[PDB]
Amino acid sequence: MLTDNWKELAGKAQSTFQKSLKQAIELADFDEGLAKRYGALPSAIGANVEDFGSPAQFPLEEYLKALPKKVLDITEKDPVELLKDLKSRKVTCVEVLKAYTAASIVASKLTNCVQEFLPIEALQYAQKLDADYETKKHLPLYGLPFSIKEMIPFVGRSVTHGSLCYLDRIVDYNADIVNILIANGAYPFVRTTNPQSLMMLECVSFSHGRTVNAYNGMLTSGGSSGGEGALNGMRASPFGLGSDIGGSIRCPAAFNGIYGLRSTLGRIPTADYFSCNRGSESILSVTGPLSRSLDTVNLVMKTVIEAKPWLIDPTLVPLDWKRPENKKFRVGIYVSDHIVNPSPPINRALSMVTEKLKSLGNFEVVTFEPYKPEKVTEILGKLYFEDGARDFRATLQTGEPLLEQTRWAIEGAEDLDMHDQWYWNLQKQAYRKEFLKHWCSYTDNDGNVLDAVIAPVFPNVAAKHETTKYWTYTSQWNLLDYPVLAFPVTKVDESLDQPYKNYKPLNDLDKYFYEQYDSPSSFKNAPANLCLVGLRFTDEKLVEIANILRN
Amino acid sequence: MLTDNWKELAGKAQSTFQKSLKQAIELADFDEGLAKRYGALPSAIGANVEDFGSPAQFPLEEYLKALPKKVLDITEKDPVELLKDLKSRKVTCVEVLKAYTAASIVASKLTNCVQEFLPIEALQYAQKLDADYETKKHLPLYGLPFSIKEMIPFVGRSVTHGSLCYLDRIVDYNADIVNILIANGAYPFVRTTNPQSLMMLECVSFSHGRTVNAYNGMLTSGGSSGGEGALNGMRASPFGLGSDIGGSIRCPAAFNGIYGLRSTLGRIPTADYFSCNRGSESILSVTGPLSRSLDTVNLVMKTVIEAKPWLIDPTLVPLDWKRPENKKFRVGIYVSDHIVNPSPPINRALSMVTEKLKSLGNFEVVTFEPYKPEKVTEILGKLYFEDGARDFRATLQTGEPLLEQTRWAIEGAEDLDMHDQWYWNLQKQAYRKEFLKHWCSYTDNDGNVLDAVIAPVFPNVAAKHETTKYWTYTSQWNLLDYPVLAFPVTKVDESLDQPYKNYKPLNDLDKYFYEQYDSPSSFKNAPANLCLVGLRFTDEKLVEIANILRN
């Protein structure tokens, strides 16, 4: 690592971004009308990484007004549909790159979701893909650009996960999943922001400033894949890759009203990502796609898994990506863990999705009760930072300040002795086994297991900054390693989502979240998403049920 | 844990065994002819756990002479063929139990492979299985008894993995894999011996004494599943369950000339077994069957997996047990790791198997080179005993002496700090990734991967006592977690397997093993086995190739 003063390093980070932003504008080739509107947009980028600017109230509305038909006709197109145009040559690989580059630039200024553009290598990828049209026409993602979280290695770049001390950590390789996607006709064109330590459900770092929600600029984008949620919520990327060890894929997707899949560990390669606590295996992160488009989520998983990634990454299981043949479904609704109750907008989403499933004949819908959700915090309290956060704190030798959200994640971290880790590994495996028995207790008399559970992603829609003080609605499924797909349902409705009256809080933490929901106007136009949870390796059931819920 | 003096605790173990031996003889109901011959057999059981008796030179020969046709006509029958007789009711469950109980008693005396007989519960299992003949006739293992390593939990028994201090650790439940087998018509009838710490390729403990080879009583049975290898090598059980973290299933199976499957981690449940270092996850043990019968190995795997064990044990992958469709095969021959060369009998087995595969049109045979086998010892040297052997050494507070083989396994153990474990976890995962690339380097121009590798299980046939000082030929595949099937080839031939003349040792350890092989007469009648190695989750390819090699 580095030991220079952090203010100098933040400058170096800003320079890298500004250097890539300059090259991107050249690639995008604005006409004067757009250059004018772009110049006049409210920015979530400040003068320094501690200055958070003055973001728009509805960044997405500003985005749709600012960008021309020449761009939106491509970036607003569903990526699976756009792949048809790229295949039939109604649109060029370079043409698509130019539009999405322009979109990401406008998205970058409005939400601060881009850490580094990749226009040099992206133009080379897109140019040769056009030249090779006849031989690569058949590839399943031919011509499609995509975004990658900054923690994902890309050739010749620093990989820092937001820590300034790692700005000299250059890799000469791509992540396995990136090379696989390139082998299938795609290419990365932008690197998205990630926060300090990665262990916050928001997106603040001293490498980029603060990332904000795509639908309401006063709220967080979520985290840790906050850039990914914002960029793909603005539909300025066809899809992106994030990571999820505590909700870091599903929380951004839910806050920005798009799809995000925490895929089951052992399906797609993620270990070559960079994070804190490298070599820690007690609790493992997973990767997975975020996209505006469910069909795009499904196609990336299918494309990656059909490339047989277990022949490059031996931690992976050779299990085909297969659409389920189920005609009937048994589904549970997780109304609350009875520790922190959901805010009205989430509560209405649960009823909406419940009533829709009941209206289809082939769904049996039951209430799903929690199982010792307090044990999630206790076990993850010992295993997230099992070295007592020594590795993370060493990143602060530059003088880099400790963010308030990071404080929550590392407070109480013990430096575990080997026997302490063994104790909590046994606690971890026992809880997983107990929870499976809980899930199977919902099997019916004929032996039909629960296919999926519908649950909140968070006790609320996109949070106000520095208030993501409860993780269980996402970290529960990291402790269990269950596949979870966040999906859209509705938006805040000011008539329907007034605060609960005569509410009696369940505890101090529940009271905090109740008071956080002061009125729906504080979360105007914020998406209310939910998630589908399945047993391990049932990812595809979740996609199929999400398909039905959106038709 | 207990802290009484070990001499009485070994006493309590002997009485527990002797009380069950008394009950087994009552159940078996010897005729006077067998009772006389049994009384006069040379015993490998001594008066105390430090007296190793004086075993027969060829225990299997003495076993076949001692037992009547009334027993052998059942115990010598292939278990899959015996299942037809149990299903068609040509033989009762109780008849099969009595015969195999008798066989195991004779095997117990000759090889010292039995820790505790289970005749009370076995008679109840067999009786009610006969009573329920009409409703349970259909089960895939109806009426078949099987043996279990002592480390495997069974209702009402102590589970000690050979350590006297755990004699008061009684469980009120069976292992999941045991309950699955009982649900499919099988039942356990005997618990087999295991050694101290479980970390030796032999089978000596202060709970049972010394277990010897079924074919040559001067040699070890192997370990850690020494009882299982001996009991099933004598064909005194239809099959058994062992465990394998350093070769502890394949070494007994190979030394005793039978089949043994180190199944891929995550296919069949094993975590509820008892060992040292509970909660250690850096290197995980696996389970799997040992049997004289390849068809019985395959049927047990099929049976357990078709019970969907991932619905009780959430570490498992829902990957069906399916026979491969392959019509052509690519197979590599691993003649040596160029650290310890195999002895003449193993080298001859390699030639026999190579020429047999070549005489079939559909096998392409290539030489398979090692990839940094020295790294196996380095990494496992740090991760096998991650606490500096504190957990194991605490078992010796009873005064239980440290055996010489156990000494080797714990010498140099560091009490790893979290960062030290992280370093070696990264070394482990990097080595796995490097090795996969090495394996894939054998793919041919047409894109056909290597289907399997044929390798030694050990530098030699069944070793002389206290000489199992090299593990890599088995531990290589525990570090990589590759499925490995030990299988029979040939026996020592004193004319063909004379020592190499003018041999030049590769190093000090290779010199030791060369000098260990003084002449074939020291290993008279010893089976020369090899093993089939596959990539993760390709277990079934190994069964199909072994099927072809045995036809």
Minimum-distance CB partner of A311 among B282, B311, B440:
B440
Question: Are B260 and B201 a contacting pair, CB within 8 Å?
Answer: no
User: Which of B387, B437, B537 is facing A317, going by the closest CB pair?
Assistant: B537
Q: Is A509 annotated as a binding residue?
A: no
Rg (CA), chain A: 22
Contact check, Cβ <8 Å, A433/B313: yes
Annotation-wise, does A224 bind a ligand? yes
d(CA A51, CA A377): 33
Tell me if A245 is assigned to a ligand binding site. yes
> Rounded to whole angstroms, how far apart are CA atoms A511 and A515?
6
Q: Do A311 and B421 touch (CB under 8 A)?
A: no
Write out the H or E segment, with its range, that includes residue B92.
none
**Annotated binding-site residue? B388:** no
Pairing between strand B259-262 and B209-210? unpaired
Residues of B in contact with A424 (CB under 8 A): 279
What is the rounded CA–CA span in Å between residue A353 and residue A360? 11
Give the rounded distance of the alpha carbon of A347 from its chain centre.
Answer: 22
Which residues contact residue A549 at a Cβ distance below 8 angstroms, ignoring those fewer than 6 apart?
Answer: A353, A356, A357, A487, A489
The token duo for A331 is 């589904």
Strand, helix or coil at A141?
A: coil
- Tell me if residue A530 falls in helix, strand or coil: strand
Q: Is A333 annotated as a binding residue?
A: no
Question: What sign does the dihedral A49-A50-A54-A57 (CA atoms) show?
Answer: positive
How far, in Å, CA of A373 to CA of A184, rounded? 41
Q: How far apart are CA B433 and CA B38, in angstroms?
A: 54
User: Out of A281, A311, A317, whose CB is closest to B425?
Assistant: A281
Distance, in Å, from the CA atom of B459 to the CA atom of B441, rounded to the nearest integer, reads: 26
Q: What is the number of H-type helices and E-type strands within chain B?
A: 20, 13
Residues of chain B neighbouring A481 (CB-CB closer than 8 A) = 314
Length of chain B: 551
Collect all residues of chain A within an 8 Å Cβ-Cβ radius of residue B423.
279
Q: Answer yes or no: are the C-beta atoms of B372 and B448 closer than 8 Å.
A: no
State yes or no: is A149 an active-site residue.
yes
Of the candidates B458, B336, B434, B340, the residue with the CA atom closest to the CA atom of residue B379: B434
Instruction: Tell me how close the Cα of B280 comes to any Cα of chain A, in angstroms.
Output: 5
Q: Å resolution of this model? A: 2.7
**What distance lies between CA B533 and its chain's CA centroid?**
16
Closest CA to B347 of B489, B523, B510, B544: B489
Determine how β-strand B527-533 pairs with β-strand B484-491: antiparallel
Nearest 10 degrees: CA dihedral of A167, A170, A174, A177? Answer: -40
Neighbours of B99 (CB within 10 A): 24
| Cβ atoms B229, B222 nearer than 8 A | yes
User: Distance (Å, rounded) from C-alpha A134 to C-alpha B81?
Assistant: 59
CB spacing of A537 vs B278 below 8 angstroms: no
Sequence length of chain A is 551
| Distance from the B318 Cα atom to the nearest Cα atom in chain A, whole angstroms | 7
Asked whether the beta carbons of residue A422 and residue B277 sit closer than 8 angstroms, the reply is: yes
Does B387 contact A433 at a Cβ distance shorter than 8 Å? no
Exposed e or buried b per residue across B163-188, where buried means at least 16 C-beta atoms within 10 angstroms of its C-beta = bbbbbebebeebbbbbbbbbebbbbb
Report residue A71 as tokens: 């761009």
Cβ–Cβ < 8 Å for B529, B488: yes
Q: What's the token pair of residue A162?
A: 């937001």
Experimental method: X-ray
CA distance A186 to chain B (A): 23
B267, closest residue in chain A (CA to CA): A317
**Residue in A234, A75, A238 with CA at minimum distance from that of residue A142:** A238
Q: Which residue has the tokens 């031919």?
A: A142
CA nearest neighbour of B401 among B77, B163, B141, B210: B163
The answer to whether B239 touches B300, Cβ cutoff 8 Å, is yes
Please name which of B523, B549, B544, B536 lies closest in space to residue B465, comparing C-alpha atoms. B523
- Structure tokens belonging to residue B449: 């991967």
**Which among B266, B279, B424 has the least Cβ separation from residue A421?**
B279
Gap from A497 CA to chain B (nearest CA, Å)? 39
Closest residue by Cα to residue A3 from A401, A398, A402: A398
B422 and A280 in contact by Cβ < 8 A?
yes
CA distances from A207 to A14, A103, A167, B472 (A): 7, 22, 10, 47
Query: What does each C-alpha distance from A185 to A27, A96, A99, A152, A292 come to in angstroms?
Result: 20, 13, 18, 19, 20
Record: contact B318-A537, CB cut-off 8 A: yes
- Residue B245 annotated as lining a ligand binding site: yes
> How far apart, in whole angstroms, are the C-alpha atoms of residue A109 and residue B158?
67
Tell me which chain B residue has its CA closest to the CA of residue A427: B279
Tokens at A22, concatenated: 């300059």
Check if A248 is active-site: yes
Of A278, A387, A537, Cβ closest to residue B426:
A278
Beta-carbon separation of A418 and B419 below 8 A: no
Task: Say how far apart CA B331 and CA B321 lie, in whole Å.
Answer: 21
Rounded to whole angstroms, the Cα distance separating A339 from A350 reads 17
Partner-chain contact B315 A429, CB within 8 Å: yes
Mutate to test the interface with B, among A274, A418, A449, A540 (most CBs of B within 10 A): A418
Q: Pull the structure tokens for residue A301.
A: 């998983």
Best residue of B282, B418, B440 to probe chain A, by most A CBs closer than 10 Å:
B418
For B223, the token pair is 């370990």
Question: Whole-angstrom Cα distance, residue B428 to residue B372?
Answer: 12
Q: Helix, strand, coil % (nearest 5) of chain B? A: 45, 15, 45
Active site residue B248: yes
Rg (CA), chain B: 22
Chain B positions touching chain A (beta carbons under 8 Å)? 266, 271, 277-282, 310-315, 317-319, 386-387, 390-391, 415-416, 418-419, 421-426, 429, 432-433, 435-437, 440, 449, 480-481, 535-537
Neighbours of B23 (CB within 10 A): 17
B278–A422: do the CB atoms touch at under 8 Å?
Answer: yes
Residue where the block lists tokens 């050779």:
A318
Q: Which two tokens stand for residue A476?
A: 């529960």
* Burial of B41 from C-beta contacts in 10 A (0-12 / 13-18 / 19+): middle
Query: Residue A288 in contact with residue A242, Cβ under 8 Å?
Result: yes
